[PDB]
Amino acid sequence: SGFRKMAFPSGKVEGCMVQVTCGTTTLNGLWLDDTVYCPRHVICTAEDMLNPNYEDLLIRKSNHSFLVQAGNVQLRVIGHSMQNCLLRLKVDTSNPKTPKYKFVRIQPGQTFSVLACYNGSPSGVYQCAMRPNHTIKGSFLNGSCGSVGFNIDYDCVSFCYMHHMELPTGVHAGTDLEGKFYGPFVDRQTAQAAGTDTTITLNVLAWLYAAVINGDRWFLNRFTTTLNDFNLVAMKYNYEPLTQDHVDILGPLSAQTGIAVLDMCAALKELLQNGMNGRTILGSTILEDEFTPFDVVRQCSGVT
């Protein structure tokens, strides 16, 4: 009858984390097979970071300009190249811990676990979601760049995020494992702002189905709505528009609970218009939007 925000076990990623130093600037990298991935601003100074020109900054570096440390062990760089906003460093040694893995570009609303690291040393793990405005509400200090986000499916680690920067609002920006930013951000410490955020409607709905599956029905009602009438109230309350694709996604959960999706939208509309007036859903006083339909399914298997 309980429901946590749960992270993937982090052991397979812990074995891949390393320290990368260039000058006085240190951050984390990801050691897979004979390659180490890390943010490219490791080659910047304090001065360079306002408006770095990475073309010209990297041509001035050699293999021995990078110092890579896996715990006590020191890795020798034999090669180096830039891929968008990442550096790819080739090392003499192939990481014997390398898990089976994929590089994936995740979509807004999707969730993943973050392994926060400092000086190449894991310090914590937590779950988060790609906001619609392409930031994540993370917990990152200096030293944290190169920390990665990932999902684990079966034996296979799907890396989806590497950490690069914090925006003035306290949220965080980064790239996929090909070094392409999520969002319209760049890895220079100029005046950048997150655009307006929105609540992830599909995820709130999924969470309401979770509440029903764990036995709570108090917010349901006898009304239904059309997609267009629901989206009218969605804009009012800054919720993402609901699409027919989202309705199809919620099919299995709708099948498991016997509550039609647009009936659950009716319920949500009622919750957005009348508040929760002192009551909780799955222990929360607010409408939660960082559980995907897919998270709800793993979390609570049967138990319906």
Ligand X SMILES: *[C@H](O)[C@H](C[C@@H]1CCNC1=O)NC(=O)[C@H](CC(C)C)NC(=O)OCc1ccccc1
The contact set with its own copies (CB under 8 A) reads 1-12, 14-15, 115-116, 122-126, 128, 137-141, 166, 169-172, 283, 285-286, 298-301, 303
Contact call for residue 81 and Ca ion (CB under 5 A): no
User: Which of 42, 45, 40 lies closest to 81, judged by CA?
Assistant: 40
- Contact positions vs ligand X (CB under 6 A): 27, 41, 44, 49, 140-145, 164-166, 172, 187-189
Identify which of residues 13 and 145 has a Cβ nearer to ligand X in the complex.
Answer: 145
Catalytic, out of 16, 38, 41, 128? 41
Smallest distance from Ca ion to CB 103, Å = 16
160 is catalytic: no
Cβ count near 118 (within 10 Å): 20
> Is 265 in contact with 220 (CB distance < 8 Å)?
no
* 164 flagged as catalytic: no
Q: Is 139 among the residues that bind Ca ion (CB under 5 A)? A: no
For residue 121, which amino acid is it? S
Comparing CB distances to ligand X, the nearer of 31 and 140 is 140
- Which DSSP string do the residues of 85-135 spell out, in sequence order? TEEEEEESS--TTPPPEEE--PPTT-EEEEEEEETTEEEEEEEEE--TTS-
Considering only the C-alpha atoms of the chain, give the largest distance between any 2 of them, rounded to a whole number of Å.
Answer: 69
User: What is the token pair recorded at 123?
Assistant: 């310090």
- For ligand X, give the closer residue by CB, 74 or 139: 139
In angstroms, the CA 92 to CA 30 distance is: 15
119 binds Ca ion (CB under 5 A): no
Pick between residue 36 and residue 165 the one whose CB is nearest to ligand X: 165
Q: Among ligand X, its own copies, Ca ion, none, what does residue 187 contact (CB within 5–8 Å per kind)?
A: ligand X
Measured CA distances, 301 to 75, 218, 296, 304 (Å): 44, 22, 9, 8
Q: Of the two residues 12 and 246, which places its CB atom closer to its own copies in the complex?
A: 12
Q: Report the nearest approach of ligand X to the CB of residue 213 (Å).
A: 14
- Given its own copies, Ca ion, ligand X, none, residue 165, with its beta carbon under 5 to 8 Å by kind, binds ligand X
Beta strands in 182-228 (DSSP E): none
Q: Cα dist. 81→7, 63, 129, 200 in Å?
A: 32, 10, 30, 37
Q: Examine residue 227 and tell whether it contacts Ca ion (CB under 5 A).
A: yes
3-state secondary structure of 304: coil
* Smallest distance from Ca ion to CB 5, Å: 25
**Beta carbon of residue 125, minimum distance to ligand X (angstroms, whole number):** 16
- Of 22, 117, 145, 160, the catalytic one is 145
The residues annotated as belonging to the active site are 41, 145
